[model samples]
Each structure stands twice: as C-alpha cells, then as structure tokens.
Target: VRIALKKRPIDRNSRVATGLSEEEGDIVALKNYMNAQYFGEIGVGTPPQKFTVIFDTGSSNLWVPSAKCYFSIACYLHSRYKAGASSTYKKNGKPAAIQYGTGSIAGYFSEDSVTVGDLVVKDQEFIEATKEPGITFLVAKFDGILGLGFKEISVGKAVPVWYKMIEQGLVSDPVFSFWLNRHGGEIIFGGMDPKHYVGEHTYVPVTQKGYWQFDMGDVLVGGKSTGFCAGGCAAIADSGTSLLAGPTAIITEINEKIGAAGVVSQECKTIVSQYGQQILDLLLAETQPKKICSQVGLCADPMCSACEMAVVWMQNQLAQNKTQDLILDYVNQLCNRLPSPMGESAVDCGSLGSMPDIEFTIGGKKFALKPEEYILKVGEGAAAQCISGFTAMDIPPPRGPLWILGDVFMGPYHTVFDYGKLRIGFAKAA
Candidate 1:
C-alpha cells in the first residue's frame, strides 16, 4: 500500500500571519510550531470514516477525535469517529491517553477496520480521543496521529496497526519506506519503492526499542569535526520532527560555523565575565572539574547550565593550551552563539552561497547537507525569511545527548523501516 503524504501549507510563515502578538509567549509559539508538517488521509470504521493523520515514527498508537467528545473545541473542529455509525466497530472501553511533545489526548479504545491506501486492517485497536486540550491540536491541520513506532512505546501496550497489517497478511513484505519531499513525498508499505532512491542502502540496527533509535557517528560542519559526538551518539529517524535537533554543545558550534544568528544568553555572558577566573582557578587546582559549578555556588544561583557549559568550554580550551584571556573571551562569544530557546537560528537568505555544508557520519559514510538543503526559506517575495534547519534540544542522560533526524535530513535521504530484520536503512533520494 502506498500513501501519498501531504505537507501542510501552514508552515512557519503562517505563524507570522496568524497574529503572533496574540499568543501568551514564545513557549506557546514553540508548542504551536510543532504542528505536524506531514499528513495523509486514513479511514477508520465500517463505511470508511475519513480523517487526516500524521504518520509519526517518534511515538506508537493511533488516535483521532471521538463523537462523544463534548467540551474540547478542537474535537468539533476536526473529523470525529462516530462509533454507532460503523457496523464493524467493537466496544473495547479501555481508557487510553497519549502525550505528544506539545499536546496530549485522552480517550477510550475502540476496535474497527482501518483503511490505509488500498489495504484494510480488520479489528484494529485505536483511541478515540474525548479530550484534546491545547492550541497545538486546535491549530493542527491534521485530525490525529498514526504512529509508525514500536508497540513497546504504545499507550496501554495496544497492538499497533503496522503489526496488525503484517499479521493479517495485508502486505507482501514486512517493511515500509518514506520519501519526504515538499512536492510529492510518499509512504509505502510492504517494501521500498526503488524509484525513489539511488544505489544501495546503508543499514543500522535499532539500538533502542523506542523511537527507531540507532547509534550514529560524528557530526561535522564545513568538513570540520565538532568533537562533541566523536565517541558516537544516539539518533532517531523521526518523520514528525520538522528540523534537525541536537544538544546545545554541538548546535552552538554549528551556529557559529554557519554564521547563523542566535539568541544571546546574558547568564552565559555573566558566568564567563564574572566567574571565568574562579572556574579556571578551580580547574587549575584540580578541583574535580565536574564539581566546579557546585563548588563555586553558581549551580544554586540558577546558572547551572551556564556554569556547566562554561566548564566544558574551558576544559577544551585548556586542552589546546589556550591562554586564560583567550579562553574567557571565546566562552563569552559562545554565549551569543547559543541557539534560541525556540530552537530557531536566523541566517541571511542571500548568503546561502557562502554557507558551509553540514555532514553527519552514519554507517561509516558521510551524509552531507548542502547550504541550500539545510536552510529553510519560508514564504515568498518581500516577506521571505530564512532559518537554519538545525536546532538545539538537551535530553538528560541514560537516554540522551541524542540527535533527531527529522524531515530536514530525511527529505534528501530515502528511509526504510524494516520490521522483518529489526533494522533501518537509508539511501540517497533520487
């Protein structure tokens, strides 16, 4: 089965047009910005009730608004599943709640036939959301989400649609693939379409059960190593995410190298100017570099991130035999290079010619993103704006220091999710 994915017309420029001044703050803007970029139509129920849904790999389970929903305005705005209308609908009555990165939905499970492309998976368990509370869903063009992730992460541990598709013998092969492009992206079940890719695929094993996670190698900006992921790092191929996201450490370096303008952190500057010498002294005294932030009491003063990031910066500078003055100045400048809280970095639209290519090493090969590929141009004519495709997001340890390979990266690369082999493969998009 092949589903043609559609990119929502309401992209970044719509936020600018839709009264940004009326919003509470940038936090709300950030949440609103995550409105799923890609969507496709799916039918659920006996007579085939239609709904627009995002095929998200970052999560598991499928959910759409229910006819029983009353108070939430978002439900009324979108297509709702009328259980009584579908003859094949079976009452499961199990409560299911799903929390996305920006919003959440709570409802009960219902069994029905789900139509994806020409294939229909009978007796599929899915959530019919009764309460969807947030502007994110209210503004979303899509009605619901169809997760293409592992059942291990599924809400209530429900058997996912993909698993059911393979179990029901609906697909010939236990594999699916995505070719994400603005013009005509596609999602195909059964097997990858050879027409969308070039050469052979480089495959990687799933390192973690959830989110299609895998181990990836180094990140480079303009052919120079960033050194943060030299030991390799964890990454995921997520179609839901619109931009590439990584830790602030590497993102800052990318911003600086690409000359993308970012939000200046006053706390970072304060720490570097006020306590730079104290941190240097503590490190020079061999006072357990990890404890420097806490030893100086800056961690308690709400400058913990500022202090910790500074400590790492100083250590790297000292390793290169940098002078004290040079180290301090460099750290101060880096504060200005830090990515915005919203994860956006502005760049000159005309300067795409001079911008350098950012590369990621995966499966022992370098996948490069040219200046034109990584820079997003929103709107048109005089209102046109350009933003770097890379963003900064910090995930705490045991799970993170991770990277999200979103649509910005996926558009140029053809991705295949192989359930038959428990692996993922990527090839250059044709």
Candidate 2:
C-alpha cells in the first residue's frame, strides 16, 4: 500500500506562464502516511487507475476484474474503476476462468496498460469478468489482490507483471518493497522507505514447493526442546486470510501446552461464548504469573489486581451473549452460593472456574501474548462455516537448522514485491 496525495482537478482553459513552478499550482505532493492504496491495472478497456487492492505477499497472482462485472460483489465495491466514459473493450469476448486454493473466479482476459507508482507497462494482461462466485455473494471489501511471490510460482502466462516491467527495462532495479499495517496501511514497490529500517535484513531459506513454504528448525518452550514436526506449515503472507491456520497436530499440541482442548464440529453455532469463556478462564489462571501486561497497560501490577480485573471484564462480556446467557447465569448462580466478597469476585471464592493462557512458539521462539489473542472463530460459508471454530496452532519446531516465520508475525511489517529479482524485501512500517 502506497500513500497517495489527493489530486486537485485540472482546469482545461488555464494558461500556464513560462518558468513557473508546477508545485506552486494545484499539484498534489505525496506524503508518508499509514493509510495508502496500491495502484495496478484492471482490464483491457482502460489504462491503470489508482485502485486500492489487498497487498497479499503470500500468493503469486495479480488479478483484478473489469468494472463491468455483472454479478460480483467486488465489482460493485470496485465502482471506482468504472471508467464509463473512457472504457475501450469490445464486449464480445468469452469470459475467462480463474481459481485459487480457497475459491474460484470466472472472467474474460483483457489487455490493458498497467501501472504501479510511476512505472507503466503497455499492453498488460488483465481479466474482464461477467460473473464471479463467492466474492459476489460474500460482499468482501477489496476489489482485487496483488500476489507477491517468487517467479517460479507465477500465477499465469503474464510472467508476473512486476517482472515483466523489469525485463522491459522500465524499472531501475529488481527489488520491490512492502509494509502491511495489519489494520490499514500503505504498500510501496520498487524501493524501501529509508525511515522504516533499523539495521540489516535477515534472509531465510525458501522451500522447494508449497505456498511460499519454508523450513522451521526447532520449537522450545521455556528453554526446553519440543520435538520437531515437518511439512504442512505454510508461511502465507496473505492479506486475505484474517487468521493463520495450520494442521490439526500443531493446533492440538499448542493448545494442550496452553491448557486448551482441541474441539471441532460442523456447526459454528456450537462453539458459543461459554466454551470460549471456559477455556479463557483456565488459561489465565495457569499463566497469570508469567503474563506480561505492559503492552496492554491496563494495570500497574498486571499479574495480580489487573489480571483479576481482566477476568471480570471477560465474564461480563461473555455474560451478555445471547447464546451463552444461560451459561453466564449458571456461573452467577454458583457464585451467589459463596459468602461475602467471594460472591462479588469470581476468583476461586467458591469453586470458581479457571481460564487458559495461550502462548505461541515460532521456530522455538515463544511470544508473550495479551489475553485476547488466543480464542479462535469460524469463517463464513458452507464449506468451512460448520467445521470452523476458534483454534490456536503453534508454529512447529524447525528442522535442519531452519527457522520459520509465518504471516502471524509478518503481517505487521512492510514487504516489498519485486518481480524483477524474484525477491521480496521486508521492513518495519513507518
């Protein structure tokens, strides 16, 4: 995502004096801001427009449907790309079809001029669609995705748009850069922001085949070694996947270590707040001493008073749940049976329940987390809607002296996609 300064409308009849500065007029200057959008090509009918796409560094495809899409939700949200007065498609070609690991999209391939930042390529390949499936039904926010992966896994015959520009001698260098804010932020290509880096870059070996796969060398908790598990771990630097997912073994191991049981069902409705609260209370009680609340700043001494306060907050929030109202009422009823202050606080005053503490270990490095980081939730739709619920999968221990860094940690940093070198650069968000 790149920060773009708003442009002022150009006056057609205005006469410009010689030797005057264009900056003194209505020209807008680009500033460094957290919220910025990526600019890329859309279809054959028009030139590249300033479109905001999800900068997914995980996959290896760059695609955006035409604004003429008849039944895509992304098409409607992409209303900005509708160059109604300036479009140039023949409107007679058959629609193209594309699919991903998760879902699929159908559209017609079109030709257009693609541009990113000041770099422009002529006759770029794009997709003009009449219909798209899940995206239209789901009402997803972004219009498209910019895939950032090695050229070995390029999405289609376009030779990775970024690399094509470099081969044509349009860009000065082969390196591209990105910085995803996790929330909403800008992504930059071709160069790195000078202010976002502290020192040098650390390089990790990439896997042969998989979704940007890599080896994770080892896993250790509290300085003790946990046996390594191989394969099934994908380091997806995706903007589309809201939560990180791994195999059930990793999830089971991590949750068990953190005092959480791995439960699965086809119904999302089955995983109510009561289940979440029960697991939360137990984890908290166990990990309270080792918990760090400085990042949260809710308490002066988070291990004691603040921890209790957090549990109370969790209970109150869960109690308001419509599905789990009976569970909260039952808890309250049980608490009422206790005497005096014990009844006031749900902290072991009278057979109080426990909460769980969740900690994630990646490549043997354990990261301390706040209370809210562990619980999982389900996704929308029939395929995953039922079998989906909250889960916490720990990054498995690395093997063969390798270290793995998944999207969970990478999502907050800026990553650059350079098709020219088939390389990606990472930096902190400025």
Candidate 3:
C-alpha cells in the first residue's frame, strides 16, 4: 500500500527534511518539493549520480531547471529543484522552456549525470529554469521530472534522455515500463508483474505519424456492437494525464450501456438534461445516503424512498422547466458521489453502476481490471489528488516491438526494467 506523510508543523529554515514527521511548516514545503520531484532513482549529468526523479512518460525530453531560478509561491509549494545542492549538477549553456495544457514554465537546459537504481548515464539532458509562474506547488514535491516517452515535439528533438541510455547499451533493454499508483505509488522501470500478465502479451501495430500512436479497432458494449469505429480511438499512453479522454459521443455511449445514466462531457456538462438528472439523483442517493435524507427529507426510512421521490421530483422539475443552475446543481452532486475506489475499499457497484468491466487485449492476451483498481486513488493526500485512477489507453495496434502498461496495472507488484536484456521481469508483490 502507498504511504502518506504525516501532517505536521513546518520549519522554514530547514532546506531538507529526510524522515517522516517533518515540522508542519517544512511539511508543506517538503511536500511541495517532493511533488515536483518524481521519485524514481533517476538523475542527469556526467558521472551520473542516483537521485529520485519524476518519471513522466507523457513527453520525451528530460530537463531540470538551474539552481539559480527564482521559484514563486506555487513553485515553493511544489518543491522546485535547486541545482547547487545536487551532487550530479552540471551547468550547460543551452536554455529551454516547457509548457503544459494548464500552465507553462520557462527555464534553461544543461547537461548532467543521471542515475536510476543501479543504472547510471552520463551527459544527460537537464532543464534549468530561470522563471516559473504558478509553479510553486510543482517544485515543492519533486526534484525534477524525467521524461521517458517518445521524442519531444516542442523541442523538435529525438534525444530522450532515457532512450539515450537505451541506445548506448548502458542498461538492459530498449523498452521501459511503468506501474504508477496514485499518491506516490511505486514506479518500476524494467519489467512487469507476473500476476498482472496472465497470458501471452499481445503486440499491436503502431502508427508512424505522431510521437507514438496506435489503432483502436473497435469498441463493444455488453459484447454488442456499437458500430463505433476505432478510427477516433488512438492509444497514446501519457504519464501526465490520469484519465483516458476520448470523443464525447463514445464516452456517452459507453456510460449509457454501463447504466451510468447521465452522459456528461469531460467538464461534466449534461448532454441530455432530463435523463442526466435522474441518474445523478440515483448516484447521489446510493453514495451519500445520510446527506440525501437530511437535506431533502424525501424519505425518512433509509430504504431510499426519499431517493426515489427526489428522482421523481427532479424529473418533474425538468419537464416543467430547464435551468442552468439546476443542471449545475445536479452535476455537482453527481461529481461528489462518483464512488471513488481510492477510499477505504474498492467500490463494487454490483450491476447498477455504469462501468461494469473494462478489458484490454495486449499481445493477444487479455487483462481485466477491477473497478476500484482502475478508478480510485491508491495513495493519500496530495499525491492521490494529483494522480488519477485511469492511466492507460486502449489501442488496436501497439507501438514498436514492446507493449506499454500504465501505472494503474503495475502498482500492485514489484517490477524490474532490464535494458540490457531487452526484456522485463516481474515478481510477486513485495
């Protein structure tokens, strides 16, 4: 199970706090720093030194800001990296900038030694930031992010630091795998868990157009054909995003089959207002029974009579009039009762819940993920908040010669990435 840091006081003076039980002030600072630092024994520079790094499979290039950069409040909250304190630090003249969909950070590029577990590589690429806005929270928790995906598009370079190691034959294989669990879950580099891969690995064909794209042949609901072609479904695995987002229509169709009722957009906008309200009422009643009863008083018996009444009332209200506020209220309630599996136990919606079972076929082998494992937070606090439940993508054809598995499937076991052997090894849960 993933561990959570204890809530405590913060001491502004301490630069580094090693053990748990950090002072409250420092706790926030430390947590912020750690969040930015992805803790997978990876680092950058010559004569590589081992350091915990954020393994971002989303982008391809690896970069860490310079020690001299000025981090704002958000940066301080995220625990930004300072170069001067690192043993593997090196100054390179190249400058760089990185941006995400939500935000952006600008920094310089440098060459540095990097190490992961027993693996080490020299002259690795690093990002040195001079100005970061609204990045204080990111810099606080992580030392730096280690890019492990395909080549960087923004930088227009094929030189991924991790791929560089693979090319030099410094590690075991050309392929690397990830098993990320939310809230600082364990990340494996070399192999997969034997328990997770029950059958032969299905190798899908990859597209040559983009960074790494794959075909999604077809989508089925209840084994019935939706006639939903896989053309729009491309499997592009990203370590940065927590959920698998696709065409709104596809999502709606799938959710309807699973009995989720309302077909909302990614932003939770209700497409069909009337039906969406009914489903939202059911979900809220099922998940938050006490709140429903106390607030609505539609049913005092706890047998869900009130819930039924509320649903009926909502339906009637919708028929009589349609208001954005009512829709927004329904959306808010639904969002709250989505039944997260990250809680005390995995949510077994039995038959009522929309998502019954999601299966992925890889290398001719099929894997079924339990709802909780696939949908809820596994770790505690900010880590859990930052990481989403769904991390993998469905594709008809996989890329390269290797198959990629997301952190969702890999979190339960210990894995080893063997760059030298070109094969991954899995072990029982440790």
Candidate 4:
C-alpha cells in the first residue's frame, strides 16, 4: 500500500489514492506541518469509521480518543471512537497506559479491523484512550496515532497492525518505504515506488528492535569530523519527532556551526562561573565524570543539569589541552549555544548560503544536508523565521546516548523499513 504525503504549506485538501498489488503496494495520502509531523486517515470497525492519525515509527500502539473519555479536553477537541457505532467492535477491557515523549494516554484495548488505503487489517488490537493528559495532545493536529514500530515496544504486548499485515498475507513485500516531501509524499506498503527515490539505496541492519534502532557512524560538518560518534552511535528513524535530536554536547557544536541563536541560559552561566574551577579541580583529581556534580553539591534539583553540562564541556576542553581560562570562556559561550528545550534554535535567514553542509555517515556513505535543507523557513514575508533543525536531548546511559533522525533528516531521504530482512534503506528522495 502507498500513502501520499505532503510536508507543509500546501492545500489542505488533496486526493487520497489507494493502489494495491503484490509487487507494488496500496497508496494512502498524508499531510504534514513543515515536515514537523505527518497524518493520514485510517478506518476502524465496520463501515470504516474514519479518523486522522499520525503514522509514527517511533511508537508501537494504535490509539484514538474514546467516547468514554469525558475528562480530558484533548478528547473533546478531536475525533473520538464510539464502540457502539461499529458493529465489528470487540472489547478487551484490559487497562493500559502509554507514556510518550510529550504526553501520556490511559486506555483499554479494543479489537476491530483497521483500514489503511485499500488494505484492511482484520482483528487488530488497538486502544480506546479514555484519558490524555498534557498540552501536548490538546494542540495536536491529528486525532490519534498509528505506530509503525516493532511489536516489542507495543503496549500490553498487542500485535501491531504492521505485524498483522505481514501475518495475514495482506502485502506482497514485508517492506514499507516513506517519501516525505514538501508538496506531497508517500508511505508505500509491500514495496517502494521507484519514482520516489533515485540511484541505489544504502542499507543498514536493525541493531535493536524497539525503535528501528541502528548503529550510526561519525558525523561531519563542512567535511570535517566532529570526532563524536567516531566509535559509533545509536540512532533511530523516528517519523513522529519534528527535528533531529542528539546529545547536548553535539547539538551545542551544531548550533555554533550553524550560527543558530539559542536561548542564553542564566542558570548554566551561573553554574559555570561559580563552580568552574571546582569542577575542573575534581576532574583533575581523577573524579568520576558522572559524580562531579554530586560531589560539588550542585546536584541539588534545580541546577543539576547545568552542572552536568558544564562537566562535559570542561572535560571536552581538557582533552584538547585548552588552558583553564580559555576552557571557562568556551563553556560559557557553549551555555549560550545550548539548544533550546523548546527544540528550535533561531538562525539567520540570510546566511543560508554561508552555512556548512552537515553530513551523517550511514552504511559507510556520507549523506550530506545542505544548509537550506537543514534549516526550516516558517511563515512568509516579513513574519518569516528561520529555525535550525537540530535539537538537544540528553537520554542518559544504557538506554541512551541516542540520536533521533526525524523529519528534518527524513525529508531529504527516502526511508524504508524492511520487516522481512530486518533492515532499513535510505536513498535521496527524487
């Protein structure tokens, strides 16, 4: 199946097409917000009750607002599924809760056939969300989410619709490809549309099951290596996220390189000025990097993160043989360069040509992004604003140190999820 997708700033209403076959899949249509998110309609129950949903590859559950959801304002604002309205509805009654990156939903499992394009997945287990908390859901454009991730991450161990699609012999190939573009894009099931991409695809095996996780190689700016991710780094192709997310350490460098102006952090600056030497002293005394902030007594709630960031900054500087004075100044400037927690850092709209090309080494190939590609231009005329596409997110150890390559990266590259061979493929979008 193939679903047409539009990135942003286009006509809201577009043709929805479905073409089904063994070699070629069905096509459904999707619309997006400046490549921030993508949404399309899917049907549930009999007569195909329609509701818009995000085809999120980062998550693993299909959930829509429920008629029973009385308390949450988010439910009232969007389409709610009525079990009584669908003849094929079957209740599972098991309580389930899912905590997403920005919101959480509490609901129960329900069984019904899900229709995507011309493909109908029978007996699909999905959620009837009775409660959705936080402003994240309240202002969302889509009604619900249809997770395209692996079943291993599915809440309540419900078999994902993608798994069901493969199990029921609904698609010809166990592969789905995404062509996210500015005007319109497509998510094809079974096989890819050769016209959406150009040349050969660079394939990478899935290193982990949870989030289509893979081992990514080094990152370069203006053809120069950052030296971070030199050994390797964990990355995921997440359709739900709007921007590229990585450790603050690297994001700070990117902000500097792109000349993206970040929110100057007073707290970060305070921590660096007041405790800079103490942090350096501890590090020089062979203190554990993780324990520096706690030992210095700044690990108290409010300033903990700032203290930790300062530690990483000092350590990075020390490695390059920077003098303590120069190191402190660098860290102070870094605090200002730290990516905004709100995600977007502003850049000069006129400097797009002067900015460097950021490249990600994937499958031993350098995938380069020109400045115009990585920077997002929002609105138009005098009200126009240019924002950097990279954001900072520090996912702590063991399960972390990860990078989320979201729409900012996907918009320029065609991505494929191969369930049968357990690999992902990327090619320049046509």
Candidate 5:
C-alpha cells in the first residue's frame, strides 16, 4: 500500500494553484533573481508607495533608498521611500547603518503604515537610507532589504517589521515558513503551508539564536562522513544566498570529489576580471578557491561516469526508503564512488538526470537534496550546463566552520522557523 505523505487544503480559482491557511497573515509573492535571492513587493505610507525588497533572514535590518539619498546611481534604480510624502510617516531621526557581505548602508529611522495583502500594520519601523556603497547595489534589482531575523540582530535594536506585525495583529504565531523556489517563492508571515511539502517532519534544535542557525551534526556527501567537516558545525538556514556556502576546507573536499571545479588556486583568478581590481581583490580575498582547498587532497582523482551511475543508484534507492541503514549504505557508496574508476565519458547532458542527492545530518535528522534540486540546469538543451549547488567562501572565525544553507536546501523542503520553541522544523516538499 502506498502511504500518503502530507496535505493541506486550499480554495482553487479558475487559474489558481496554492497553499497556506491564515486569515491574519500576509502572503508576499516572491520575485526570483539570478542569484538565490527572493524578493516581494511591500507598500508603505497612506497611499501605499511600493518597493521590492529582499526578505532576508541572514541579517537584521530593513533598508530602502530615501528620496534624499546621496548615492543616486544605485538609489535611482529602485523606488525610493519618501517620508515627506507619506501622511502616516513618523520619524525618529536616529542614525543607523547595516553592513552586508559586500557593502554598507547608512540611514535614518521612520515609521509608516505598511500593507501586504489584506493585512495592514501601523507604526512599522524601517531604514531610510541617505548613503550606500556603489559596488553591488547599483546593479541590484531590488531597492531595499527587509530582515526576517529577531530584533536582537537589528542594528539599532529597532524591532523588525515582522515582529512588529505580531504585536499589531498580522502574524499571530511566533512561527513562519519559507517555501522558496527558483521561479519566485512565497512567504506566509506567521503561518505554515502544507501544500508545498510532504512526508514526516524533521525537527532540529537551534544551536545559535542568531540567523535561524541550528546544530549541524555532520555533512555527509553520500552516506559516510566527508571528514572535512564532521562532528559539529553550525548551519544557518540563509535565504539570501544562491548556493550552499561552507568553509573553504569543507567545500573543497566536497566539490573536488563531485568533479566540480575550484579544487585549485587559479580557478578564482578567471572571474576577477568581472569586478574591478580593487573590488575583485576584496571579493577574491574573501572567496578565492585557492584559499578554500584543503591540503589533505582527495581519495581518488576524478570521475565522469559516476554521475551516470549515481543517477541510477539513487533513482532506485530513493523509491525504497526501507531504513536509515540502507540510506547510509547508499550515501557511503556514492561518496566513495566519487572520482570513481568509471572515469569520464561522452554522456549527453540529457542523461544528467541520473545525478545523486546530497544530504546533511543535523541533530540526528537527515536533510537531503534530490538530484533535480542540486544539479542546477542552465542554458539550452545542447549547450545546457548542469552544476552542483555548493561553493567555498571564507566567513572568518566567529562565522567560520559554518554552513549557509541557501536555496539548494530550501528548494524542496518546507522550512519552519520557530522563535517560540527556539528550534527549526523541516518536511519534504510535496
């Protein structure tokens, strides 16, 4: 007998398909970007002036361009928020600044009536940026960033817009779910959606209260430990990144075995031309592949046909989830098979569907990414290139030995962030 995974009921329209059940919460329709970032439209003011912002959980701060911004190059790209025009606007005039991986934004504080869907919030605090760095923002499509993290992480200790909604009557629960996808995802503030997920829920305890982080038990490539990063690691379920980013050591080991690029130093130099010498150096200094590789090297050279073999192996094993023992056995086999004796072949990208899923263990629960999810497809049929969803970066010591579980991890899983319980819940996407 085939057992049902999970289900949630929702009303269907003539041209509709959907999920989530919350009369009080707002449903922000996410817009997909080339990067793993997802953004949605939100309006602020009496007449509801709208702007697209990245709903990032990685950092805490809501920042949008001001009408009086000093950096007009980037500021003009997006819809700037004008406090003077909004009748509902209230200014605290306190100076604030937030730092991201690439740039920083300095702004002031203001409160206004923010609306999303049928839900409305009064006195919502956000940043009215007067100055910003030109490097990344000038080309970025989004005008602002709306942080989903707790108030503790906020720069000015200003309450986050999401938390403010809870007090103002939008989100009733301290829980929210991120059901992100490649073609723009949706966030149901203070609610859960079952239509996007399947199977039993896996619970992982939060190791750090910051950035929706949890205790990552181990990173298993197939089933066995990669050893590059084992025993203990903190993983942040970040929605801001495109791929799975980890310490240089861990990623090199994982990437090398999978026959992915960046096992050597010169790999990063090729991309340096894209950004200027000054910015490229700083960017490379933080994420150069040479700096990412572990001197330990690989157990085998490289494999081409292994991807072909793993596809068949997992296509069978995934259908037969008999026990944890079987799962690990298959995992171990896949890892060992990397740089397999099978070697490279002239297989077409069409058969690339055979690739195996990558899994990670956190708090005794296995979070697995299927082949379709990790093996990203780009370009057309013949020229279409498939790539793994992992890369190396230097996040420093305090942030070091950490994993940023980006879209690759969230693509298929229905992730629940529980602030009340201080834990995270995961379920397979339906």
Candidate 6:
C-alpha cells in the first residue's frame, strides 16, 4: 500500500485532505514547532480520550498524564488520563519512573486501547503518569510522548506502541518513516512516503539494537587521513535534536576541510588610500610624510613637547576616519576572528562555501555535499547571514565513538529507519 504522509487539517484530528492513504486509519494532520519538532494528537483508553504527543524515536514507552495527576499544577494544564473513566483501562500495578535531562516522571503501567490517526491498538501497554516533576511538562504543548525506538531500549520494558501496531497488523508495511522539513513535515506509519524523499535510497545495516542507530559514515572519506573513523562510528538518527553533533575533533576537522569550520578569515583587497597611509605614518613618526603640525615641538618647552605630543587627536584630517587600508591595516590590532567587517563584509561567510565538497563514505558508498549544501544562510533579506552548519562538537575524546547526522545531512537527504529488517537508509532529497 502507498502512503503520502503530509500536512493537513491543521488541528487535533489531521484529516488527510487528498489522495489515497495506506489504510483505513492512515492519515492524520501534524503540527510543526520552532525547532522542527512535529507532534499531533492521539486517542487513549476506552471511548478514546485525546492527548498531544511527540513522535520521539530516541526513546520507547508511551506515557501521558493520568487523572490522579490533576493535583500537580503541571498536569492540570494538559490533557490527562483518568484510569477510572476508561472502561478499557486495566491497571498493571507496576510503578515506573523515567529520569530526563530536564526532569522526571513517576507513573504506573496499564493496558488500554489506543488510537493514533487511522490505526488503533488494543491492549497496548503505556504509562499513566501520576507525578511529573520539573517545568519540562509545564510549558510543553504536548500532553504525552510516544516513543518509536526498538523495544529493547524501552524504559521499564514496556512495549512500544508502534511495535504493537505491527503485531496487530495495523500498518500495511511494518515500517515507518519521517520527513522533517524546515517549517514542518510528516511521519508515515507501516509504509513508505515516496514523495517525501528524492533519488534512490541507500541501505545501511543497523549495528546496534537501540534508538534507530547504525554505523556512521566517514567524513574523512576522500580527504587527508584525519584519523576519524578510518571507518564507521556509532550514530543515532534522532529526529528530536536540532543539529548534527559528533566527536568534536571529527566535526571540527570536517568543518575545516569544507572551509565552513569557524569565522571567516581576512584576505583584504583594498590598497591603502592616501589619507589612510598619512594617518599610518603620523602614528609611526614616519609621516613628516603627511604634514604634521605638532604642538609638541612648535610651541613648547622641552618638557612641554613630550606632554603636548601625548594629547594630539585627529579629526577628518579630512572627513570620516579613513577605514581599511593596506599600510594602516598592518599596524591595526590583530583581526579578531573572521567573517567580520572588512569594509562591511564579515570576514567569514564569503569563504565557507569556496572550498571542496563536504563528503562522506557510508556503508562503502560515496556521498558528498556541495558548498551550497553545507552553508546555511540565516535571517532573510539584507539581514541574512550565512553560517556553518558544521562546527566543533564538544563531546570529549577518550569516550566511545558517536555521530550526530542533523539538519546539515537530513535537510537535503532522506533518512530511513527499519524496525523490521534492522537497517537504516539514506538518499538525496528531491
């Protein structure tokens, strides 16, 4: 069956506005957030109570607030589950809690009928949080989280909702995919979303058992031996993160090679204007060359000359302080980082895309990103500034290997994860 995961309806129930769907319960509208996170509403428990959830593949275990949590001010604002209200909510009596970078949640497990879009899973095990700590849950627009990672990594050993969909044959393809665009994108369950990606997708074997992870490609693919992955590094394809992060050394060198590493450097072109040179010589005591009417020697005692020379300041000597010059620039303070103003151009942006391709070798095949692919122009109109997407990742060395393939790679490429066959795929985006 074919599925076109797309944006529509713009509300809780995302109604696929057009075209054929993968199945009866196939399509749903999704909401996009500032950092490219896409989330939507899902129905839980008997008679289907609704809650918003982020489709997070980096974790497993589905959870939402339970009515018992209404006492917590954070829970009062979001949609919550009332175990007593659902005819299908069966308590498992196993208490659970998961710690997060921002906070934690204390909850108990239960089995219930769940509906997401056009599909429903009966007897799905999920957490009904009774206690959620920290402000993380307070400001969040979503009421719940539906993790899509492998069951092996599930917190508290709970079955992931998506896996149950496959066990129940709810999805036609037994596969799911994502297409995260700049403003927003979509997720296709149980089938492929063809229009979401372009070109032929390349397959890579999953090297581990969790978090849609696989062996990372070599960034030093065709360049000098930079000592990065003479081969593959462990990489997780996470949709929740904003940009690529990896071994600092690796990403640092990758940026350096692509010419998008740090601030732009100085390669000035303007010859010293006559006025600029005059000022330069006067400062150096060489410009008897410019016309110095020094109050120092002209009107003063021997001691007065030294004192007078200390206070002489310059004005237009003409008009405006003569800026940027070959001779004067030499005595000027060391250039403070690049992509900064030469005459008005910051020292860096113009040079980042001037070098070679940011290439990679993944699963034994070659992939390359042209300069236009690596440099992202932020802001818009005259205010727009181009910055490097590839920069230093501060993850210390002496640690296990890791790679983050973020927007820089995902933006122009289609990343596919396989839960059934155990592999990941990459293809150039259309």
**Which prediction has the highest TM-score against the true structure?**
1
Model 6 Cα lDDT, one tens digit per residue, 355-384: 666666777766777666666554443665
lDDT of 4 by residue, 168-227 (tens): 999999999888874557788899988888888899999987778788887777876655
Ranking by lDDT: 1, 4, 5, 6, 3, 2
Report the candidate with higher TM-score, 5 versus 6.
5
Worst 10 residues of 5 by lDDT: 14-23
Question: Which residue pairs show collisions in model 6?
Answer: 14-29, 25-118, 67-81, 264-338, 264-348, 339-346, 339-347, 339-348, 340-346, 340-347
Clashes of 6: 10
Off by over 4 Å in 1: 13-35, 278-301, 314-325
Candidate 5 residue lDDT tens string, 1-430: 0101111111111001101101111101111122434667778788888877766777666778888795557676768888888999898889887655345678888888877655567888888888876444655656777777767677788888777777776676877777775245677777777776877667786776656887786676666455545557777787665567665444444554454533223212221222123232232244432222222121122221222222223323333343434543443333432321112111235544555456888757777776667655544566755555664443334553667776778767777877777788778766
| CA-lDDT, candidates in order | 0.80, 0.38, 0.41, 0.77, 0.57, 0.56
**Model 2 CA deviation exceeding 4 Å by range:** 1-50, 72-77, 80-95, 135-137, 150-156, 209-211, 219-234, 257-407, 413-430
Q: Would you give me the overall lDDT of model 5? A: 0.57
Better of 3 and 4 by TM-score: 4
The residue ranges of model 4 lying beyond 4 angstroms of the native Cα positions read 8-35, 266-328
lDDT (tens digit, per residue) of candidate 2 on 173-230 = 5665544343333445555666555444443334543234443333332333333332
Q: Spell out the clash pairs found in candidate 5.
A: 197-429, 197-430, 198-428, 222-331, 223-331, 223-332, 302-339, 311-354
> How large an RMSD does model 5 have?
13.4
**Residue 325, model 2, lDDT:** 42
Backbone collision tally, model 2: 36
What lDDT does model 1 reach? 0.80
Worst 10 residues of 3 by lDDT: 21-30
**What does candidate 3's lDDT look like per residue over 307-374, in tens digits?**
43334334333433556357446534443333222222122244434555554433233345545544
Task: Assess the local accuracy of residue 136 in candidate 5 as a C-alpha lDDT between 0 and 100.
Answer: 46
Off by over 4 Å in 6: 1-36, 70-73, 220-226, 254-357, 368-400, 406-408
Better of 1 and 5 by lDDT: 1
